Amino acid sequence: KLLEHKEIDGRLKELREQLKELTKQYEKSENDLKALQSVGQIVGEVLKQLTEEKFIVKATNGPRYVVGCRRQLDKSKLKPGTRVALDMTTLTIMRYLPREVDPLVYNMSHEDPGNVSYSEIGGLSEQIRELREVIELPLTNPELFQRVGIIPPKGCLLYGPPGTGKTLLARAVASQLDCNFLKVVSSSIVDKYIGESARLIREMFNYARDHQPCIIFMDEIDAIGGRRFSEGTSADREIQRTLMELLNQMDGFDTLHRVKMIMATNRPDTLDPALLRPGRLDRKIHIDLPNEQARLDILKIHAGPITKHGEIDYEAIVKLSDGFNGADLRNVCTEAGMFAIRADHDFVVQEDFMKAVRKVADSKKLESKLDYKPV
Amino acid sequence: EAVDQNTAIVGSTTGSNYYVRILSTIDRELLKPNASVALHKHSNALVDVLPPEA
Amino acid sequence: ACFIRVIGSELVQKYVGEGARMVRELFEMARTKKACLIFFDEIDAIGGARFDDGAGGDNEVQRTMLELINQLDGFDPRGNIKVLMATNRPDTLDPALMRP
Amino acid sequence: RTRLLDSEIKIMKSEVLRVTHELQAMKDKIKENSEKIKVNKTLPYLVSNVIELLDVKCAVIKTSTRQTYFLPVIGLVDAEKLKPGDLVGVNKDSYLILETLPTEYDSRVKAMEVDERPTEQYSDIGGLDKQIQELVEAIVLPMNHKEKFENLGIQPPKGVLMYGPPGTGKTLLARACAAQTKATFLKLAGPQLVQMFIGDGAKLVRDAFALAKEKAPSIIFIDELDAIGTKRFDSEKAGDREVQRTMLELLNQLDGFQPNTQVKVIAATNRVDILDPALLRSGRLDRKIEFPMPNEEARARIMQIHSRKMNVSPDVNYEELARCTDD
Amino acid sequence: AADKQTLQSEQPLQVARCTKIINADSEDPKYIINVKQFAKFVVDLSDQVAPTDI
Amino acid sequence: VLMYGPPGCGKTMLAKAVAHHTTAAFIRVVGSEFVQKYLGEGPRMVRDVFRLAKENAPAIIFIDEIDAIATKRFDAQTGADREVQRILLELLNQMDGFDQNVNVKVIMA
Ligand SMILES: Nc1ncnc2c1ncn2[C@@H]1O[C@H](COP(=O)(O)OP(=O)(O)OP(O)(O)=S)[C@@H](O)[C@H]1O
Ligand SMILES: Nc1ncnc2c1ncn2[C@@H]1O[C@H](COP(=O)(O)OP(=O)(O)OP(O)(O)=S)[C@@H](O)[C@H]1O
């Protein structure tokens, strides 16, 4: 005679699940009913402090006021250039916040997917190690730099033919540090106005001033950097002054603190030789079109998830190919598996690699000017 | 500007312009420029004047 | 005996679908009468190319042009109504009325 | 024989506390959902924008009258569901985030979606037959079976180029794949990307690709890519800028960073030689598919395809007709 | 004063701001209005109208 | 005062050091934020700097920009000509030749 124990325990557990999943959502909605008594607070900024409790302020949508804090708001921490909160009705200061974002920063900052580490890439081991010495070190420890006593360097630029995985290398960086990446495509900065470009640059740079270990990556900088000639196009005046926004605020009065800039271009020639002086960017390091061992190693990276057999003629694929990126190897391996899927090879024959080398090497009829060598 | 004794005209940061009775508290010459002055929320009258700003 | 004349930039009026409302008006005056002729001219500002980026501007033209494709041909075709369209270019038109 | 007595007194207490569970639900929901319907039925509840979102859970609201309102208590959403730079609906009096607006698109993006989807059954394409085969294998099967790729483990393809003479048929694949595959079709022309309005085509590219991100079976038919696809110069005082901004934004938004197989990119140019080396390379457009001039029988075939629904007397020799058509 | 008394009876009968329509949702009326100048709005109707002709 | 030289001679470095040595109220701005939308906006910025300058002291106040906002080409109706005009006229008309007791040595380079 013990079934009533289970016949009450199961009902107690199920009614407890009901009461928990219902009454807890009911307590959250009770907190929402309490939030129905919560007031929207005015955004604004201190203009200047006059007395111990009078504070000259200005609404960002309009008027100007002299008001006071609550009781414990740490008035000393209000310094002109801080973003504060005001009451709606009595208009008294309720809070100060860390500064704004203007969410164009958000929609390219936290859009970033983390990647695999540098195990995906290869044939740039010199670039891996040396660019590691110019990127990774002073946030691991900045004090071997201070054991010798020298200020750490600032930044670099990647160049060569387009698409070799300059940005994929930055992705391998974006998988390594995993800390504070701001990666901007760096051409949409001109909206339709004049100083809004500069203002967004300032907003990102004060975000980099607030947060310590920041990383900056800009791509296709030819649109935004450009070259200074005598003034022709009025739509290049803006690019010259935006470039001077870069010329100051990559050095500034205050030098940056752990704010690394990483750069990657398709042509570094058209950049102004005011930007080619070191200190700002330390060295322009080259990523090349691969060699035999480079093609072989990145190919064997791409030869991984393949239902192959004892047929893989590595040397014919690498030697019958005459300059092909990691993504060109994606093209060749992908379409070799496609030629397998052409007439449905559930396995992978090697002879389709020859067909893919045929197709892509014949497709290279279309691409000239294979270099832009800086300085 | 001031029309007469202790009653004057102030524009505002609310958008429009107003003509206000001002107290004898502020000294009668402290209002030469368009100086930073203090008004009332509800009933719009001068309390104090601050000479610097900006 | 019938004819109506309509310049394109007559529809430059500053409310959304007002030009589309006059497309409604012209197509519901067309079916009242038999063997009639509305005439079209300056059909570039009426719109043939779907120019767009993230602006949201000259869109009454856009929805009016969609209303034009809708009531023009497709969904109870024309009958005893013929309308000529005048231009200097077959270059700035739509491939949806170049629907062959 | 008293464990059942304690458990049945606890079951009467379970009915009591379950009446209390239903009480804390429904009786409190009287107040809550009554006044939350009533706050939803205050107005068309003053749509607005979140500027940022903090967690000291705390949000800043800008109205659609461009007036700002912080709150340290958000309300009827969660901090993860919203994100800053969103359309949001806010009470006029309490200034409270109520509900998210489902209007997060543009205007001529919604006009860009070709809704008619005209019919091209595969009788019509004649002479491009191996192009039909390579085309289906490189585009339609990415829409159907990624199992067919990654059970052999390679990749799905990344764009295909349709080029040849401007008569031999580039419109054919557009209407054919739109009518025969049942994915979400979207097209794109070239002078659309030619704008007097500076600095806005990046919004077109990124917002159309977010549209493709949220309408995942996304055929995107780029047409006349060689309009803005032009091989670059390095001159002085000669040339515009924003065409290169839109072109390079399409490039850096397609390749370089953030890849996605929720996009399918179909471009079709007449000529190829004007195009950049960066517009193709091997992840921009994977394939380089030239089109044959219709040899003899392809001319006869398509000429009969146009004469399918017309009255044709059988005294017609198509090989004679198409064979005395040269070029 | 040819209708002055009825004009002293239309003072409790006054409604209907101008408010051009942008668009709507689906499955329901649920329209969307800008007034003129202020803002935008996602509106719903009073009950004694025709949801067809909106 | 006016400076020139190739990029990389430590151009801001002198301004850094002279800001360090001095006692005065080293108000700094930079140049490329002067190009802004509303009427006389950057001109209002220059007058804010000058009125606050004459309010503080003739102590030392600082600006560091010359290039491409104030070129000698007055004569072009080619874009932002309201802004180009107000910047050029503001620079000259607040230069004035002199103000004689304010804003010691705007250094341009
Ligand atoms: N199978 C076909 N059916 C109908 N028209 C065809 C066919 N093949 C070719 N054409 C004609 O070929 C011409 C051009 O075809 P398309 O190349 O698709 O036009 P398009 O859209 O201008 O392509 P572009 O200019 O290269 S981006 C038109 O006059 C078409 O009618
Ligand atoms: N002569 C120098 N010797 C050593 N380091 C120097 C020297 N000049 C500048 N620096 C370094 O660069 C910083 C200051 O350089 P800047 O004065 O900003 O040059 P610059 O102003 O950026 O050049 P411009 O303005 O683009 S022409 C110092 O903090 C040092 O780190």
Centre a 10 Å sphere on the Cβ of residue D181 and count the other Cβ atoms it contains: 17
**How many angstroms separate the CA atoms of D190 and D222, rounded?**
8
Testing the interface with D: which of C50, C51, C53, C92 to mutate, by most D Cβ within 10 A?
C53
Label residue D286 exposed, middle or buried (CB < 10 Å: 0-12, 13-18, 19+): buried
Residue F9 annotated as part of some ligand binding site: yes
Closest-lying ligand 2 atom to the alpha carbon of residue F15: 17
* Torsions phi, psi for D321 (to 5 deg): -60, -55
Task: Tell how far the Cα of A280 is from the centroid of ligand 2, in angstroms.
Answer: 9
CA-closest candidate to residue D284, choices A348, A362, A367, A301: A367
Q: Is the CB of A85 under 6 A from ligand 2?
A: no
Does the beta carbon of A360 lie under 8 angstroms from any beta carbon of chain D? yes
Which chain E residue lies closest to C60 (C-alpha atoms)? Answer: E22
Q: State which residue of chain C sits closest to D187, comparing Cα positions.
A: C50
Hey, is D87 helix, strand or coil? strand
Nearest 5 degrees, angle CA C8-CA C13-CA C15? 130
Cβ-nearest to D111 among C54, C57, C66: C66
SS3 (DSSP) at D20:
helix
Ligand 2, atom nearest to A151 Cα: 31
Q: Is D288 helix (H, G, I), strand (E, B) or coil?
A: strand
Q: At what angle do helices C18-30 and C60-72 cross, to 10 degrees?
A: 20
Q: Facing residues of D48 across strands? A: D63, D88
Solved by what technique?
A: cryo-EM
Beta sheet of D218-223, edge-to-edge order: D184-188, D218-223, D264-268, D160-163, D287-290
For helices A234-249 and A196-210, angle between their N-to-C axes, nearest 10 degrees:
20
**What Rg value do the Cα atoms of chain D yield, rounded?**
30
End-to-end CA distance of chain B: 21
Mutate to test the pocket of ligand 1, among D122, D128, D129, D170 (most ligand atoms within 8 A of CB): D170
Any ligand 2 atom below 6 A from CB of F11:
yes
> B13 to each of A89, A240, B7, F20, how far by Cα in Å?
18, 36, 19, 39
Helix H or strand E encompassing D200: none
Question: Which 3 state secondary structure label does DSSP give A16?
Answer: helix
**Helix, strand and coil in chain E, % to nearest 5:** 5, 20, 70
Say how many Å lie between the first and final Cα of chain D, rounded: 103
Question: Cα dist. D201→A237, C17, D228 in Å?
Answer: 21, 25, 11
> Is beta strand D184-188 parallel, antiparallel or unpaired with respect to D87-90?
unpaired
Query: Which residue's alpha carbon is at the smallest distance from atom 2 of ligand 2?
Result: F10
CA–CA distance, A161 with D280 (Å, rounded to integer):
13
Pair type for strands D287-290 and D264-268: unpaired
Tallying the residues shown for chain C, one arrives at: 100
Q: CB distance from C15 to chain E under 8 Å?
A: yes
- Residue D6 CA to residue D11 CA, distance in Å, equals 8
d(CA D102, CA D87): 8
Task: From residue A367, give the alpha-carbon distance in Å to each of A373, D231, D267, D269, D286.
Answer: 17, 10, 18, 16, 14
Displacement of CA D319 from its chain's centroid (Å): 44
Q: Chain-centre distance of CA B36, in angstroms?
A: 8
What does the DSSP assignment read for F38-84? STTHHHHHHHHHHHHHHHH-SS-EEE---TTTS-S------SSHHHH
Which pair of tokens denotes residue C7? 């310049």
Three-class DSSP category at A43: strand
- Distance of alpha carbon C4 from its chain centroid, rounded? 14
- Nearest residue to F67 (alpha-carbon basis) of D189, D16, A241, C49: A241
Task: Work out the number of other CB atoms within 10 angstroms of the CB of residue E45.
Answer: 13
Provide, as residue numbers in chain F, all residues whose Cβ is less than 8 Å from the Cβ of B54. 48, 51-52
Give the list of residues 6+ apart from residue D181 with CB closer than 8 angstroms, or none: D140, D143, D219
User: In this complex, which chains have at least 3 CB pairs below 8 Å with chain D?
Assistant: A, C, E
Q: How far is CA A345 from CA A77, A244, A341, B27, in A?
A: 70, 58, 5, 97
Identity of residue A319: K
This PDB structure is determined at a resolution in Å of: 4.9
How would you list the strands of the sheet with C4-5, edge to edge? C4-5, C36-40, C81-85
Residue C99 tokens, joined? 């629907």
CA–CA distances in Å: residue D270 to residues A351, C92, D130, D275, D291: 33, 18, 19, 11, 10
Strands D264-268 and D160-163: parallel
Spatial contact of E31 and E49, defined as CB atoms under 8 Å apart: no
